[PDB]
């Protein structure tokens, strides 16, 4: 039964590992389908966006340090929404895209648009906005796979930029937060049992505050799994708060100006109610839209038919290898449909192609967002959807 399946899975992974040297990447290694969850990475990102109420709280908070704490709460809250066993999202194909929306309790909507912008090396970009609350998020996920011996990792080199568009600094520009991502490990692959862990550092930086949060691994005897430890500081070396606890249990905040005080509950992940994204029905989705593209694989995963899931996934990835060969033959390269290459020196590799002026009427911002790609039920693709973003911005100003 399951014990015999576990032994064969063990054998399959050992035979892959036996040929590798610690320190190498895994870009050329195909992993088996029985470590896959039923969503692509483009959708997995939205797990981290399932607690918008904390972001709405931050936006309404006038004190910069308190506002920073709510942003940290928003960002830390999503990590525990993750598969239970040892599973990873599907690696998206080049040009795959995924859109979603939320119906928020305040009668507003949040919108999400994402695209896989590169395959070698893998990269996806995402855009998230709540126009009627003047909240905008732009980000990139850049996973660099690594074999380390008894462990493997996705070294997470992406980042997220959050802006409160109507909270202006001295320069009149929106208040900006940059947030990085901890690395995702699987440990115990050689002499143990596989377990997923977060590790290394998460950095959160605002105009006047910063936090460095270390995601720790357990010791042999001391410590616990899934522990976090960090400090909220200004940029002059003053420490204001200490964060502690576990990112998938209870996180605590200690006021460092009150030495005798004890850490208070900051985030109890077992008492939070996530808000899940909504998506257009499958009948309206495009060929390379995430849920539609992977539907045959995820259907086979859902019935535990791993021969079929493996064959369906190979067909998709083989087709992509053929498309890449055709690009070389035509002497062209891929360019994303929905994201334009950022200017040099900026935090992000890609940004959504559409110009959305920071202070225009949020109804006009919503209309611009909905023109980018079908998000809401009933919206249809236009012919222009499929042309590259760089060709779309050329016309977005050629008419001007």
């Amino acid at each position: 039964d399951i014990d015999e399946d576990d032994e064969s899975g063990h054998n399959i992974i050992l035979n892959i590992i036996s040929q590798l040297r610690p320190g190498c990447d895994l870009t050329r290694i195909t992993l088996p389908t029985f470590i896959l969850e039923k969503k692509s990475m483009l959708e997995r990102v939205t797990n981290q966006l399932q607690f918008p109420e904390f972001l709405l709280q931050a936006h309404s908070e006038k004190d910069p340090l308190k506002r920073f704490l709510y942003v940290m709460k928003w960002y830390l809250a999503g990590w525990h929404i993750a598969p239970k066993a040892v599973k990873k999202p599907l690696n998206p194909v080049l040009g795959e895209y995924f859109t979603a929306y939320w119906d928020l309790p305040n009668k507003q909507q949040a919108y999400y648009i994402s695209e896989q912008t590169s395959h070698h090396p893998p990269e996806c970009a995402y855009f998230y906005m709540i126009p009627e609350s003047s909240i905008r998020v732009d980000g990139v996920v850049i996973p660099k796979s690594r074999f380390l011996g008894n462990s493997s990792a996705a070294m997470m080199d992406g980042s997220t930029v959050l802006q409160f568009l109507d909270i202006k600094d001295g320069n009149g520009k929106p208040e900006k937060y940059v947030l990085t991502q901890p690395n995702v490990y699987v440990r115990g692959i050689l002499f143990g049992k596989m377990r997923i862990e977060l590790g290394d550092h998460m950095i959160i930086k605002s105009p006047n505050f910063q936090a460095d949060i270390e995601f720790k691994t357990k010791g042999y005897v001391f410590g616990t799994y899934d522990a976090i430890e960090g400090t909220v500081k200004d940029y002059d070396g003053n420490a204001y708060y200490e964060i502690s606890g576990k990112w998938n249990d209870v996180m605590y905040l200690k006021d460092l100006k009150q030495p005798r005080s004890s850490p208070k509950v900051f985030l109890d992940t077992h008492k939070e109610s996530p808000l899940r994204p909504k998506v257009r029905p499958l009948s309206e989705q495009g060929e390379y839209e995430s849920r539609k593209l992977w539907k045959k694989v995820t259907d086979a995963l859902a019935v535990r038919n791993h021969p079929v899931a493996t064959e369906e996934k190979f067909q998709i990835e083989d087709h992509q290898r053929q498309l890449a060969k055709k690009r070389i033959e035509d002497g062209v390269e891929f360019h994303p449909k929905l994201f334009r290459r950022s200017k040099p020196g900026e935090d992000l590799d890609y940004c959504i192609y559409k110009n959305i002026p920071v202070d225009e009427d949020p109804e006009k911002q919503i209309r611009s967002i909905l023109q980018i790609a079908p998000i809401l039920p009933g919206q249809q693709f236009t012919d222009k959807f499929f042309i590259p973003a760089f060709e779309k911005i050329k016309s977005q100003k050629k008419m001007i």
Partner: peptide, 27 residues
């Protein structure tokens, strides 16, 4: 340049009452 067609009315918190009941259900 638009990649998608627009709803006949752009949805906002301000026209929510046109799209939902006073009991909160769709119409």
């Amino acid at each position: 340049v638009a990649g998608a067609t627009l709803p006949e009315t752009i949805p906002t918190s301000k026209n929510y009452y046109l799209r939902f009941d006073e009991d909160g259900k769709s119409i």
